[PDB]
Amino acid sequence: MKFGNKTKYGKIQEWLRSNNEPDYRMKQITNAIFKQRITRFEDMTNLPKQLREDLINNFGETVLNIKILAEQNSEQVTKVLFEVSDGERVETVIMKYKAGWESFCISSQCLKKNLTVDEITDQVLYFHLLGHQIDSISFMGMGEALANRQVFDALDVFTDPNLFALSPRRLSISTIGIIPSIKKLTQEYPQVNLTFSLHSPYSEERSKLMPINDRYPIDEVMNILDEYIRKTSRKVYIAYIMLPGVNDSLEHAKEVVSLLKSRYKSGKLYHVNLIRYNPEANEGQVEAFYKVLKSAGINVTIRSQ
Numbered sequence: 001m002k003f004g005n006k007t008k009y010g011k012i013q014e015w016l017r018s019n020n021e022p023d024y025r026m027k028q029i030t031n032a033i034f035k036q037r038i039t040r041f042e043d044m045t046n047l048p049k050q051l052r053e054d055l056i057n058n059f060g061e062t063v064l065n066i067k068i069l070a071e072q073n074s075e076q077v078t079k080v081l082f083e084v085s086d087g088e089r090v091e092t093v094i095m096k097y098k099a100g101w102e103s104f105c106i107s108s109q110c111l112k113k114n115l116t117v118d119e120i121t122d123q124v125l126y127f128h129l130l131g132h133q134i135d136s137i138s139f140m141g142m143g144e145a146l147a148n149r150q151v152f153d154a155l156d157v158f159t160d161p162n163l164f165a166l167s168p169r170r171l172s173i174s175t176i177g178i179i180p181s182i183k184k185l186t187q188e189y190p191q192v193n194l195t196f197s198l199h200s201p202y203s204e205e206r207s208k209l210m211p212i213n214d215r216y217p218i219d220e221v222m223n224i225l226d227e228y229i230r231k232t233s234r235k236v237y238i239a240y241i242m243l244p245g246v247n248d249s250l251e252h253a254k255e256v257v258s259l260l261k262s263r264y265k266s267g268k269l270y271h272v273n274l275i276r277y278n279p280e281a282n283e284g285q286v287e288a289f290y291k292v293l294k295s296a297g298i299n300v301t302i303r304s305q
Contacts, residue, residue, distance in 0.1 A: 001026060001162060006153055008118045009163060012059060021051065030162045033063050039129050064129070066090075066122040082126070084119040092123040092141060094132075102132055107141030108148040117153035124164065134164060138172040140195075144212075145173055146181035155189050168192045174239060176212050177221040182228065190232035195273075196225055197239045200247045201255040209247075218259070226264040238272040242289070244280035253292035260298060267298070276304040 001023070003010035013026045025047070032044045040062045041047070041055045066082040069089070073079070078094035093105040106123040108115060124134055137158055139145035151173070158166045168191035175182060176197055185192060198218070200206045207213035225236050240256070242248045260267020272293055274286055286302065293300040 003160065003163075004117075004153055004156055006117060006150075007121070007157055008059070008063075008065065009157065009160075012055070015058060019054070025051070027162065033125070034128065034163060034165070037129050037131070039063060064122050064126060065118050066126060068126070080126075082119075082123065084115060088113065088115075090115060090119065090123070090142060094127070101135050102127075103136045103138060104134060105138045105140050107143075108139055108145035108151050108154075109143035112143060112147075114148040114150060117150045117157060120150060120154040121157045121164075124158065128164070134166060134170075136170045136172065137166065138174070140172070140174045144176040144178070144197075146175050146178045146185070152184065152188070155192065159189075176210060177216045177218075178212070179216055179221060179224045182221070182224045186224070186228045186231065190228075190234065193237070194225070194228065194234075195237040195239050196221065197241075198256070199239070199241055200252065201259040202252075205247070222259070222263055229264055229269045233269070235269050235271050238270050239275060240272060241275040242277060242282060242286060244277060244282045248282055248285045248289055250288060250292060253289045254296070257293060257296040257298060261296070270299065272298055272300045274300065274302050276302070 001013065003013050009030070012029060016025050028046050029044065032038045032046070038044055041052050041059070042061070044052060066084050068080065069083050070081045071078070072081070074096070076096055076098065078096060080092050080094070082090050082092065084090055088110050090107050090110060092107060095103045095105065097103065104124055104127065106120060108120055124137060128134055139151060145151050155168070155171060158164045158171060159168055168189055172193040172195065173185065174195040174197055182194070185194065200209060201218065203213070203218050206218060228234070229236060256272065260270055263270070274290060276282070276286060290300055290302055
């Protein structure tokens, strides 16, 4: 039980320890939040009463530091807009897969301000308290979720056996190509599903599309994803959102082929996801594009949702 000196679960633990409260008192708190699913300190009746109120004064009434505001709508996709800190709004998404599967697409950012690990983990803790079971978590909401070092603390919270107790395999992070963050994630949370946002194999059309490519080129992000593949022998997903007419050519597809086939193990531990588009038509070329990577032995899946 060591919850990290920047999450709210750590402050409570070593505030009770500074009040000379025994070590089992934090476990009573965590089991109430995650196993009994109790939101407020007062309904944690296993605690003493003035301990419940000492916890209320220093940490507020509830365990949540986000608030719901709008719950816009549901049926297969339930988005929510919470309020945090400086009246900030942040948006979270629930892809209710029709087989049931609740995947939580949380956000790490808001001029681009970053949320604390509390504001990130509560996007999940909120729905856990209502009755939802957290099957998977994905950092694919606001911005690119590796410009925020708090995400690494959020991973520790989600995988903590005394908190959410989620497996790292249930967690997914999509990156823009920030190399130093990839290496930190490579050997600290390797079982986390890593997705690389490519969107054009051309080193120049790409920084015209996503300016971060200018300091972190395709070549050297594909090199750090390679040492990932070598050291953890896991699959990296190549996301490719296809803009009509722009990047859905045939030799865009085949330049994606040689880009992978030149990599470690000829790009075969990669997995390309071809993202479809809604309001040039594209429902026909995606298929040719699909076959061009498929004919070349590239593991490829079409995602139309």
